[PDB]
From a paper:
Whereas [name] repeat I and II assemble into an N-terminal [name] domain via intramolecular interactions, two C-terminal [name] repeats III from different molecules interact with each other and thus mediate dimerization of [name].
The N-terminal [name] domain resembles the previously published [name] structure from D. melanogaster (dmPURA I–II WT) with an average r.m.s.d. of 1.2 Å. However, in contrast to this invertebrate structure, we observed for hsPURA I–II that the four molecules within its asymmetric unit of the crystal lattice showed marked differences in its loop regions and in particular at the edges of the β-sheets. This suggested greater structural flexibility than average domain folds and most likely than its D. melanogaster ortholog. Already the different molecules of wild-type hsPURA I–II in the crystal unit cell revealed considerable conformational freedom, not only for narrow movements of the loops but also in the folding of the β-strands. For instance, in some of the molecules in the asymmetric unit of the wild-type hsPURA I–II crystal, β4 and β8 strands formed bulges. These observations provide clear evidence that in particular strands β4 and β8 of the N-terminal [name] domain are dynamic and can adopt considerable local differences within the β-sheet.
Residue numbers in the entry: 58 to 128, 141 to 211
Write the structure that this text describes.
Amino acid sequence: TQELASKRVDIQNKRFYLDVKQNAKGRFLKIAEVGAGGNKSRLTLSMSVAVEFRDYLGDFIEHYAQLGPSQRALKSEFLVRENRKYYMDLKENQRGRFLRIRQTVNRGPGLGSTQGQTIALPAQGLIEFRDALAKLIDDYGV
C-alpha cells in the first residue's frame, strides 16, 4: 500500500490528515483525527465516495454560514455506499459548533461498531477541510 499524498488541516487546536493511498483494489482516502501521540480515529472512503462527501460538506458549510449567533443536532445527514455508512451531524456544545462524522459498516460483521471511526471537526475548519479534500480529489481523481 503506497501513499500518493497527505494534507494536514489544523483547526483550532485539533489536527486532521487527509491522505490519498493506492492498492490493487484502487485509490482511497484515509482521514485521521490526530490525538496526542497517535491517530484518535480514521475514516476510509473510496475516491468516489469522497466526491459525495465533499458535496455534503458544502451543504454543512452553507448551513453553518447561515445560522447566526447561538442562543439535538442542528443538521443530520447520512450517506451509504459500498457497505459503508457515514453519519454526519452538525452540533453545538459549550465550546462551539462542530461537525461529527462517524463511519460504520452497513451489514456483515461490525454491524454498528464505530470505534476509532468517529471524527469531530470544529465548524470553523469546514471550509478549509472541504478545500483540502477537493484539492486531493482534483489531484488524484476517481
